[PDB]
């Protein structure tokens, strides 16, 4: 698990995200779609987005960014007692959306990059560590539900 000190750092970092959840959520998704265009194909609602300019200008992309990060914030604030919040996300991402676990690895890396991009020099070595642990716990707990389903 994460230690208390570690959960505290994660939640301190999450405070930075909450000041602009849509902005953060949009940049996360844009970072994902542009570094991994296969990921765009999982979204019929974003597949028409031919350019980064188009992605940037999509209010519906922002809205979904808000949905994504609100759900993750929910989970993070549970400090690993997150099974009730996590299991249904796991299940819809395997069964409905068909999201391989590697794509969750991609979006985890995108979150780390965006935190550095938006908080250069304000997201220290300790904070990166604690947030990376939190994101690995999230991803590992979803992996566990995927295995149960035999997904991927
Ligand atoms: C952080 C990681 C992460 C979180 C917290 C997340 C949370 C959500 C939530 C909440 C919904 C709406 C409820 C549901 O379960 O259908 C949802 C819908 C979705 N998600 Mn995801 N999702 C991903 C990663 C995430 N998703 C990744 C990675 C992929 C693609 C590569 C993805 C593709 C989807 C698709 C597709 C939908 C349905 C979008 C739509 O409304 O049309 N996403």
Q: Which of 62, 68, 103 to mutate to test the pocket of ligand 1 (most atoms within 8 A of CB)?
A: 68
Domains present along the chain, CATH in parentheses:
1-152 (1.10.490.10)
**Dihedral sign of CA atoms 65, 97, 42, 81 in order:** positive
Residues with CB under 6 A from ligand 1: 39, 42-43, 45, 67-68, 71-72, 89, 92-93, 97, 99, 103-104, 107
Report the separation in Å between the CA atom of 149 and the middle of ligand 1, taken as the mean of its atom positions. Answer: 18
Structure tokens at 18: 């909450």
Report the separation in Å between the CA atom of 93 and the middle of ligand 1, taken as the mean of its atom positions. Answer: 7
Structure tokens at 139: 């991803």
Give the nearest ligand 1 atom to 28 CA. 1
Q: What is the resolution of this structure in A?
A: 1.9
Q: What are the binding residues? A: 64, 93
Report the separation in Å between the CA atom of 89 and the middle of ligand 1, taken as the mean of its atom positions. Answer: 8
Report the separation in Å between the CA atom of 10 and the middle of ligand 1, taken as the mean of its atom positions. Answer: 21
Report the separation in Å between the CA atom of 110 and the middle of ligand 1, taken as the mean of its atom positions. Answer: 14
C-beta pairs of 22-27 under 8 Å, 24+ apart in sequence: 22/62, 22/63, 22/65, 22/66, 23/118, 24/65, 24/69, 24/114, 24/118, 25/62, 25/64, 25/65, 25/66, 25/67, 25/68, 25/69, 26/56, 26/61, 26/62, 26/65, 27/65, 27/114, 27/117, 27/118
Give the nearest ligand 1 atom to 106 CA. 28
Deposited experimental method: X-ray
**CA 136 → CA 2, 82, 129, distances in Å?**
11, 13, 11
Residue 84 CB coordination number (10 Å): 8
């Amino acid at each position: 698990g994460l230690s208390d000190g570690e959960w505290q750092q994660v939640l301190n970092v999450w405070g930075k995200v909450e000041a602009d959840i849509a902005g953060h959520g949009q940049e996360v998704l844009i970072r994902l779609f542009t570094g991994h265009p296969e990921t765009l194909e999982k979204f019929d609602k974003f597949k028409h987005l031919k350019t980064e300019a188009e992605m940037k200008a999509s209010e519906d992309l922002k809205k979904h960014g808000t949905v994504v990060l609100t759900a993750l914030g929910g989970i993070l604030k549970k400090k690993g007692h997150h099974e009730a919040e996590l299991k249904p996300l796991a299940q819809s991402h395997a069964t409905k959306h068909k999201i391989p676990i590697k794509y969750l690895e991609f979006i985890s890396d995108a979150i780390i990059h965006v935190l550095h991009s938006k908080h250069p020099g304000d997201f220290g070595a300790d904070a990166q560590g604690a947030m990376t642990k939190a994101l690995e716990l999230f991803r590992n707990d979803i992996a566990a539900k995927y295995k149960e389903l035999g997904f991927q």
